Design a protein around this ligand. Sequence first.
Ligand SMILES: [Mg+2]
Ligand SMILES: [Mg+2]
Ligand SMILES: [Mg+2]
Ligand SMILES: [Mg+2]
Ligand SMILES: [Mg+2]
Ligand SMILES: [Mg+2]
Ligand SMILES: [Mg+2]
Ligand SMILES: [Mg+2]
Ligand SMILES: [Mg+2]
Ligand SMILES: [Mg+2]
Ligand SMILES: [Mg+2]
Ligand SMILES: [Mg+2]
Ligand SMILES: [Mg+2]
Ligand SMILES: [Mg+2]
Ligand SMILES: [Mg+2]
Ligand SMILES: [Mg+2]
Ligand SMILES: [Mg+2]
Ligand SMILES: [Mg+2]
Ligand SMILES: [Mg+2]
Ligand SMILES: [Mg+2]
Ligand SMILES: [Mg+2]
Ligand SMILES: [Mg+2]
Ligand SMILES: [Mg+2]
Ligand SMILES: [Mg+2]
Ligand SMILES: [Mg+2]
Ligand SMILES: [Mg+2]
Ligand SMILES: [Mg+2]
Ligand SMILES: [Mg+2]
Ligand SMILES: [Mg+2]
Ligand SMILES: [Mg+2]
Ligand SMILES: [Mg+2]
Ligand SMILES: [Mg+2]
Ligand SMILES: [Mg+2]
Ligand SMILES: [Mg+2]
Ligand SMILES: [Mg+2]
Ligand SMILES: [Mg+2]
Ligand SMILES: [Mg+2]
Ligand SMILES: [Mg+2]
Ligand SMILES: [Mg+2]
Ligand SMILES: [Mg+2]
Ligand SMILES: [Mg+2]
Ligand SMILES: [Mg+2]
Ligand SMILES: [Mg+2]
Ligand SMILES: [Mg+2]
Ligand SMILES: [Mg+2]
Ligand SMILES: [Mg+2]
Ligand SMILES: [Mg+2]
Ligand SMILES: [Zn+2]
Lengths: 24, 78, 60, 155, 98, 127, 117
Amino acid sequence: GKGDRRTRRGKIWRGTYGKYRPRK
Amino acid sequence: SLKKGVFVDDHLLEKVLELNAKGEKRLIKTWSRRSTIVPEMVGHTIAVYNGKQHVPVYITENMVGHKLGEFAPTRTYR
Amino acid sequence: ARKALIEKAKRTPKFKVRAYTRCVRCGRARSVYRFFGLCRICLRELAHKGQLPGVRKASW
Amino acid sequence: ARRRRAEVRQLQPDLVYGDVLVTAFINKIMRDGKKNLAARIFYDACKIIQEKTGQEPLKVFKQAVENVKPRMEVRSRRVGGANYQVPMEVSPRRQQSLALRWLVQAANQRPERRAAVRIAHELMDAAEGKGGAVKKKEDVERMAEANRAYAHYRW
Amino acid sequence: KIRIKLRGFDHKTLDASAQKIVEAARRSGAQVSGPIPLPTRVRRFTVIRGPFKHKDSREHFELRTHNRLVDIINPNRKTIEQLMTLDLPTGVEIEIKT
Amino acid sequence: EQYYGTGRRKEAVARVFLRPGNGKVTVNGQDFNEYFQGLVRAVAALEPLRAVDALGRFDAYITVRGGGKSGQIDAIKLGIARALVQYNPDYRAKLKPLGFLTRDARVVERKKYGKHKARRAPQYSKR
Amino acid sequence: ARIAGVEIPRNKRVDVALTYIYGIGKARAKEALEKTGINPATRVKDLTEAEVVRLREYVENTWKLEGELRAEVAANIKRLMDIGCYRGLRHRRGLPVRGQRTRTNARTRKGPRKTVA
RNA sequence: AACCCCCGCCGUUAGUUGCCAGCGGUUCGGCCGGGCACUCUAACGGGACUGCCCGCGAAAGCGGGAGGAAGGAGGGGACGACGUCUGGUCAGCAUGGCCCUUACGGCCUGGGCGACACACGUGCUACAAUGCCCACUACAAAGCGAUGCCACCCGGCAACGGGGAGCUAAUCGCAAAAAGGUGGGCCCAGUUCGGAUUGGGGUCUGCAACCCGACCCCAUGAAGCCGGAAUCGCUAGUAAUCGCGGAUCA
Ligand SMILES: [Mg+2]
Ligand SMILES: [Mg+2]
Ligand SMILES: [Mg+2]
Ligand SMILES: [Mg+2]
Ligand SMILES: [Mg+2]
Ligand SMILES: [Mg+2]
Ligand SMILES: [Mg+2]
Ligand SMILES: [Mg+2]
Ligand SMILES: [Mg+2]
Ligand SMILES: [Mg+2]
Ligand SMILES: [Mg+2]
Ligand SMILES: [Mg+2]
Ligand SMILES: [Mg+2]
Ligand SMILES: [Mg+2]
Ligand SMILES: [Mg+2]
Ligand SMILES: [Mg+2]
Ligand SMILES: [Mg+2]
Ligand SMILES: [Mg+2]
Ligand SMILES: [Mg+2]
Ligand SMILES: [Mg+2]
Ligand SMILES: [Mg+2]
Ligand SMILES: [Mg+2]
Ligand SMILES: [Mg+2]
Ligand SMILES: [Mg+2]
Ligand SMILES: [Mg+2]
Ligand SMILES: [Mg+2]
Ligand SMILES: [Mg+2]
Ligand SMILES: [Mg+2]
Ligand SMILES: [Mg+2]
Ligand SMILES: [Mg+2]
Ligand SMILES: [Mg+2]
Ligand SMILES: [Mg+2]
Ligand SMILES: [Mg+2]
Ligand SMILES: [Mg+2]
Ligand SMILES: [Mg+2]
Ligand SMILES: [Mg+2]
Ligand SMILES: [Mg+2]
Ligand SMILES: [Mg+2]
Ligand SMILES: [Mg+2]
Ligand SMILES: [Mg+2]
Ligand SMILES: [Mg+2]
Ligand SMILES: [Mg+2]
Ligand SMILES: [Mg+2]
Ligand SMILES: [Mg+2]
Ligand SMILES: [Mg+2]
Ligand SMILES: [Mg+2]
Ligand SMILES: [Mg+2]
Ligand SMILES: [Zn+2]
């Protein structure tokens, strides 16, 4: 959920991009 | 977690390095608890401060990467 | 600890992060806007005096 | 709600059958404003509706809703002292809201995994009579007729 | 070639002065595109109305910063010297590119 | 020849261009049945046509943008209504009674202070 | 099959299988598959016997785990325990090791509520 | 009440926003020629007043209908009387009286405000199939940024580091908006639900992350199968749900 520190929904809520999401 | 330069206040080594010469004592009051335990720091006695007094905490090769503050409790009920 | 404390925030004779915000009129520390350099309180007094140009009681 | 009778909120007719009742039933399925699923899910059931029975989903739905239309219910009252459960009439507007609610509520009560099949089976059983949603109707209707005694204070 | 930007708080004066330039520059020189009202920059500021424990009913106001635009296409010296002594602002922010 | 009508709803706005032809209609590229795939209310904006029978007699190049997806369909629902009523005065007689010509004032309410969602008050207590 | 030499994930997709292995997670689950050329979707039950050994040999050697892993994690704490550091003393009183809340919550390291008042 | 503001319909002023809508060209991106139509942009206006028809009525006014983008306060905001609570704050500031004055004032280093056998309030994340995961694809508003937001390429699993273009900003950036669409897998399991906890490795800020930051990766995966007595919010674009911004600030 918006709590899993290791996924899409997690990084969306947490305010970070991280590995489990696009970047540069 | 800091990596470029394993910080540790100079006045720590400035005071202990001269000890590394003639292999002198170890008695010395300190305050830089935020400093790391120097790799070459083994076998010494830096009395760390905790807001009340200096803890005569002895060092060993097991306690190295950690900060010198860890081995000086601040909360009085350990 | 109010005057020698607003003086402390002025000299900046030491490290970077140690300097911090402060109100111009009073000396507050929290709720101090950078734009005006003022605390939320006086800012509301002045804004009712019009001593803050362009500012007006917003509503929508 | 003390002033006016408050106008009943009219809803937009179905973009697939044109009846306002269908969409109303859709809304109960809906959740968190995700009205996208409810419509789809409802029609998903309709797909299974014909697969099982030769009947069209439009009539089977109207048959199901009718069989779960409670003619009478019980409402609590204060006789200036004690508190009975007076049996009495039931507004037309209500009979629908309930016949839809219980339908949806009881729909999720089924064991099936996929939601649509639960509403499809429910709608069949409701139109039939053996529906669980129908029980919540048959059951409530009793409560009323049991207390037929306290009907004097019908107000 | 030449361009002018007029940021300002009091849109009342910034509207009339945006007119003044269009009055002179046009009626004494090249073509000048009419005043273009740009999207306004706005800084609101909500703040606890009271001086203490009352985190609500807090008052808030704004600080608009209106923008208006005007362009003189041909730098005719007839308009250049007039638009250099005829003006008279009070709180407008005039700028000029090329 | 042509027709036109604007449609606003929820920051969303739409220009409706009509041109006699098949059932061809596409808003800002992409086939219409592609810019609203999976969405059930898709055929809503097209409803204004079924009133005038001209469902299979007109084409449409539409320009809609701003706001969210669903609100757009309603902007076209009115955009087209303004269209075929434009280059056809007496068509109004049976287009307002059916209800298609209205801006729909419904818009999102501003969040209030001391609240959570302009109306949802915080959890009350006493303990 | 008994892959971890002790653990025995079976009858379900292989990619999720090795997950149930202690010391193996979702990450190494996807890696081990590719690092031995194996279909992730296939079930553990119906699978090539040769592949069984292949997946086993890899993981059982690539990275330590299980009882020795547990004793490793426990050793890293045993040292803290004896070292006399603040980090260890939080394992001592059983309190959290992140300096986090203690006036409330922290139930996970404190166990159920002791109440009394 | 009304005079002010935002949001609804429309007109005038305005053409670096916008559109082959119109023709031409095109490296087929509104990039170029070009125009103010439209959209948008922020200024001034227009419009709605029970004015019109009907029934009641002394009137005020109410009920229904037509026309209208909008009918009796169209929706939202700003604004809160004489006063009451010996309400709140002398710690924002001001101030009468009172007290200290090598000190009840000043400087720093380290500590604490982060303490935990508990209790209450407010809240976040979930117990899942109207769901979770992975890939692809579409639609916002309002905002903030020149020792600041950083396109684009290179290294890295990643947070980040280096090179480096654009930008006193409707011209450049923060910027994928998520839910949703399509596809695919999971098949009712304390599970691909759930991420608390913790071991190890690591990036950034900043003199400095033991006390005491945040973020990334691997591994470890807890309680929790809808919650006792009790109790809260909301009447319409509202509740519910989904995501984005800013102030504060290294
Ligand atoms: Mg970079
Ligand atoms: Mg760590
Ligand atoms: Mg290290
Ligand atoms: Mg020196
Ligand atoms: Mg002083
Ligand atoms: Mg600071
Ligand atoms: Mg909302
Ligand atoms: Mg608590
Ligand atoms: Mg006109
Ligand atoms: Mg052409
Ligand atoms: Mg033409
Ligand atoms: Mg070409
Ligand atoms: Mg062009
Ligand atoms: Mg050309
Ligand atoms: Mg004007
Ligand atoms: Mg009126
Ligand atoms: Mg009248
Ligand atoms: Mg009258
Ligand atoms: Mg008459
Ligand atoms: Mg009279
Ligand atoms: Mg009369
Ligand atoms: Mg009369
Ligand atoms: Mg009336
Ligand atoms: Mg209002
Ligand atoms: Mg008033
Ligand atoms: Mg205690
Ligand atoms: Mg209590
Ligand atoms: Mg994806
Ligand atoms: Mg992609
Ligand atoms: Mg977009
Ligand atoms: Mg700004
Ligand atoms: Mg700066
Ligand atoms: Mg390069
Ligand atoms: Mg790196
Ligand atoms: Mg790469
Ligand atoms: Mg860099
Ligand atoms: Mg380079
Ligand atoms: Mg340069
Ligand atoms: Mg710019
Ligand atoms: Mg730019
Ligand atoms: Mg951008
Ligand atoms: Mg289970
Ligand atoms: Mg299973
Ligand atoms: Mg230092
Ligand atoms: Mg559970
Ligand atoms: Mg309570
Ligand atoms: Mg209400
Ligand atoms: Zn002040």
